[PDB]
UniProtKB/TrEMBL annotation, chains A, B, C, D, E, F:
The keyword Plastid does not apply. This is Lipase/esterase. It comes from Lactiplantibacillus plantarum (strain ATCC BAA-793 / NCIMB 8826 / WCFS1). GO terms for molecular function: hydrolase activity; identical protein binding; metal ion binding. PANTHER family: AB HYDROLASE SUPERFAMILY PROTEIN C4A8.06C, PEPTIDASE S9 PROLYL OLIGOPEPTIDASE CATALYTIC DOMAIN-CONTAINING PROTEIN. Residues 30-210 form the BD-FAE-like domain. Ca(2+) binds at residue 33. The keyword Metal-binding applies.
Length: 275, 275, 275, 275, 275, 275
């Protein structure tokens, strides 16, 4: 295993990635290209949550994929998230295509994963980067490669749907209301989505995931949805690894099955080797 | 996540380790010390099998533990595995104690994992390093730190018990017949052992694991044993990650549950945080 | 000790830092969080002077603090220093807060040090970043963390006060005269300043430092000031370490005591462990 | 030998370089400063061709020079190449001057190599960076150092001269027609050029290189030109190293002597040590 | 291109290597396995000469091969060169086999290159490692992989043949006289040898190379030999790259063609891709 | 500043070093060779004390020298300290000579610093490595380079002189009593020594330094000695940097002047640039 931390400069706003590369198993007689997952964590658009970075990447690497963590555009200075964060995703996928041979990446198996705020970028991107009208508007044109599916964990999907609370916090995120709500952007072009959330999510009401999934079916898009009964927002892995020390509310054994559900779903979709 | 690859020189035969350090999560308020697992892979004493190195490390690391892979003494040159391989383990545990504060290692939770030939070293060590008589005999004296438990996967336990096939290959492994068989070395002071193997193991006969568990019980040491019904030798993870490309015999979905079994077992022993 | 060199992208103009991290002492039974000093060297806004980077960092590291060298915005292309350089400082402090647990940084003990042209950035920042009005104007809002004190060595404080020599050179630094003079930016909210300069400073008139201290006191901010009697501009450490080879005019034994004065002043401020 | 990969932030558009530094020979009793070659590969302004990076840098390194590969501005997002790419070259040369002491670089011996699209940037730069009229217009002022010579392999010199085909592709490269054609930008100020191309270049008509040389003589700049008889576009080293697997058309043994011709030409100019 | 510097511990005397790995070209739609050359420099058995390390490795790398520099056993402390250096060579080849898949090494194309004292190790190894009686005697048994050919530049072949001078120097190198002379070790199992030397070699008489070739033929091993008319010992590349500053005697344009001769010879042996 | 961690294999027992290299100052017109200090920490021959590694290295680095920390042979396995540790010092000095050109090391200014147990190795080495009789006997022959002076801080000088307490502990350190006591090894060939200790040293009675200093004047070798009136063993820097958290007994302001005293002592010896 190798770890690469790096600035990519091929977008208007340069950004940092952290790639975790799988190494070839040395006593294999032949080579294998592995899938790769790009993770956009949460942190409410003002920071990148560590709980949703390495611990999630490591769990997915365990199942045999490369992973990359994208530090997408935050609110800092008077900066807005969009349209920049969308462009950084496109550049990250592009950059991956250039690294394929060196790292044995299966470019037909590029997965994006978003959590909370992170989910908005990915949900939007699955929307935006699947319609050339919105591609051009947002300058995702001229980037190589594309993603095969998305995974969304308790995603922000609609900025008027409870998060963020105050109007003045919507606006920081963006004064472009044409993507306050990722549900309205779904077309039959959108790539297959695995979605999960808790029903008891106070900070990001489940209608977000419902609305995306609802809209995912209404345009015939292969989608799976798990709304677990209990659990607070931001469970991450919902187990001791991502548990804030001494805070039981981060433990939820029912939600903790999601990575297994996710991986099995990726296999079904032909996007991960089956055993 | 950092990757450290390094020679340790505090043994008669210097040796390489590869450490994979967990990084602290930044959204945490307080620091956490994590367990560490040292892995001795298989390879029939002539090599170190990559199938049982990083893939296994990553899976254990996904559960929230540091891991280190130890290139124990092989048959190379007119060299024998023992007693050097034992000293290298002690040196590795020692080295961990000196890295504990920089990496947040919980030294009361140092776990050893052995696979196949690698299991002999760990099994022997579990015996030798808990008996001052054999400690001193084999030069493990003056090393800091101790391991809390072992994990053995399809472990070579007795060199007269099938592997190796010829008498000339077992000699190469060692002239010292006082540890051809680790099942004879087991005494009360030994640390708890989680053991698994398949029953249809041609290469390394199940009597090996049976004999060792027999002796852990006939000696009152907390233990656990899983002998799956089917499967060839060297399953590793028994899934697509460790599957030699196109070889179905490396898939066994029943055996594939062993890491979960092992993690839950560690949690029960209070050697890994629980859920 | 670890050396991290790195681009930070969380500002309008991305920029390089070079971080020098203290490692934990391994025979300490418990962990210690250390203070951190951010250094902005001189170079007359057209370069970053090496004499005021590592040699100064190492002397400060020897007293038990992390250090980071910041390559603030220079005059290059047709770029001005301001307001960008101010933002880069805010982002660096912010970045530090995110690295605190991994490196054991005491974020309550963040010190900024500026030299010559570098002092302007720091002196201005100390004023700007303690006033929401000037904060917001210059886009320092939304960044985490704050500095506890500043250190200024022969600082450029007023752009009309002799440096730079020509009209055409002032302007290249900035077409914003509301920052030509950091002495006018001084208000009571400011963090405490240790200031030193030589009286015979031909290149940057002592009126600069004198004006700043004059305003630190008139606004009741804790300040200490050493105006040494002899010596040219840019003494740095004023000894053989930073002495341009064969040039005695860089040696000044009286000025050479400043790091000691500064460290004791920091201890007095409760911003460094006392011995 | 050392390999440095890194972002430089001293341009409006930050960018990656990959520097390959020569190490001092240890049994030399005195040090030696080595020339350095900056390489801008081709890729038709939409990517950076690996065929024209490392394999070319390694060949030039074998003759005793440092090399740096410059990832100049491409067409990505709605971005055009110019004027940004010209600034990135200036910042790279500038950065080199700042590394000269640590790496023993002879700043009197900075050479630029451009291939295909990369050649346009180098050819244009050679024009722009020698005339302060076009210097100022394109924002190259305040950057230290200067190049002593260029090398152009099958360079794009004129955008209306066959490449790019469509008009829509012209424009993506630039809506500044003023430098669609580096031929008409040559003055006596220009640095000496070694130029080569094949006569049968379908993709980028030979008239391109012909025009630049024609212009290089008509304003009398020391120059040398090799238009080989056979060979497709993008030969690179024109041997097995840069040969696309199983594609004979990338082999051309007459063109393959170009690195020798170039090196001898550099020795002639006093830009490389001689034999 | 990546540079790996590392201790290998798989011999009685552990030892450092410096590997220079070629990176795959990202434009190639398929992958390519490259040959690899192990280089044993000279230094008269008391040091490793830098003139014969990187400079030579870089020239060979430019031709499209991986290279590794082996720091073989010297006369240091009280040690003799043999039989350890032979084991270190075997362990290095072995290590390469384990790196083959991660770096795309063609294990049927492993070439050994020795210079001066380094040449003795290579020449002897070519003999020893091609004879199981002498294989075993010297403990090269149990190591994987083997080399396809050797290259010898002004090699030490016989220790009584003028190098080393005094009796007391030969003995330091080794008291085992059975391989004072690599000519006698030659048998038809020996891999093919490209050999070169100058006839005016005062330091190491030409009869050395003469005798080895003289025996490669009389044992029907494919071999080529170039004895240049002029030139001192230790020409290395015989050009400005390996020339001691201000020392013309290191220049020799006739001998300087040797790397081209060797590469063509390798192509002829099907050991390097042809043009 | 660069940090190099590394195994050296040119001794019977390979060993780790950690080198801290000063970087050249970029705004110097000329280059400068700096002195280098090799540090052997204490730890009572069973471990290397972190209190006496980096913190001391950093403080010496601040004065403008390279530093290297040597992990000399410990009591581990059934291994003794001697004669191995002496060889390791020799190889380290030797290795430095091979790195001089690359790092600008002034090989005429190599200084050894030992603390407590580490002092014994340095003190003995000072004795052994200056007399060819003991040189040959202990196999320091054939290593290049030599040291100019030693620094000893509360050194163990005689193993009967209190430390270690029991006869069982001394013997572990070594059976060879011909260097239980470095005071008896002092002859006038020895390089100059700066020596310090506290009078109240319980664990290692002042007798040791006194006995060494006494013995050092009697062979007319330039020396300096400081015996502070208070303070326990192992003060290191005797300040807050090396203070065990909450343990005042590690603070001693009088002894804390020793680095300054030592540096000024090196200046008069002409082994460090003077200011
Ligand atoms: C225990 C050891 O080999 O020494 C060190 C010291 C600092 C960091 C890593 C290793
Ligand atoms: C820029 C940032 O905060 O991302 C990280 C996170 C952990 C380690 C290094 C960088
Ligand atoms: C054009 C280029 O060099 O792209 C990269 C970037 C990082 C690593 C390898 C290749
Ligand atoms: C010139 C500058 O300050 O950037 C650096 C810093 C350290 C090393 C290399 C480049
Ligand atoms: C002396 C040695 O082990 O080899 C080298 C040489 C140059 C740089 C690094 C290692």
């Amino acid at each position: 295993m190798q770890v690469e931390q790096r600035t990519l400069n091929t977008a208007a706003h340069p950004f940092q990635i952290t790639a975790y590369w799988l190494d070839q198993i040395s006593d294999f007689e032949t080579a294998v290209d592995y899938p790769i997952m790009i993770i956009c964590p949460g942190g409410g658009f003002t920071y990148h949550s560590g709980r949703e970075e390495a611990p999630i990447a490591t769990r997915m690497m365990a199942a045999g994929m490369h992973t990359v963590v994208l530090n997408y555009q935050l609110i800092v200075g008077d900066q807005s998230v969009y349209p920049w964060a969308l462009q950084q995703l496109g550049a990250t996928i592009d950059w991956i295509t250039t690294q394929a041979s060196a790292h044995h990446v299966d470019c037909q198996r590029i997965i994006l994963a978003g959590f909370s705020a992170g989910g908005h970028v990915v949900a939007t991107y699955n929307g935006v980067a699947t319609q050339p009208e919105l591609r051009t508007r947002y300058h995702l044109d001229h980037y190589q490669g594309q993603h095969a599916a998305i995974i969304l964990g308790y995603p922000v999907i609609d900025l008027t749907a409870g998060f963020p609370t105050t109007s003045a916090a919507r606006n920081q995120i963006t004064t472009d209301a044409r993507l306050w709500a990722a549900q309205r952007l779904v077309t039959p072009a959108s790539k297959p989505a695995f979605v999960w959330q808790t029903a008891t999510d106070e900070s990001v009401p489940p209608i977000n995931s419902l609305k995306y999934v609802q809209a995912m079916l209404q345009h015939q898009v292969a989608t799976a949805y798990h709304l677990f009964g209990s659990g607070i927002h931001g469970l991450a892995l919902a187990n001791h690894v991502t548990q804030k020390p001494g805070k039981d509310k981060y433990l939820n054994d029912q939600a903790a099955i999601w990575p297994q559900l996710a991986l099995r779903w990726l296999q079904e979709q032909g996007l991960l080797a089956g055993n």
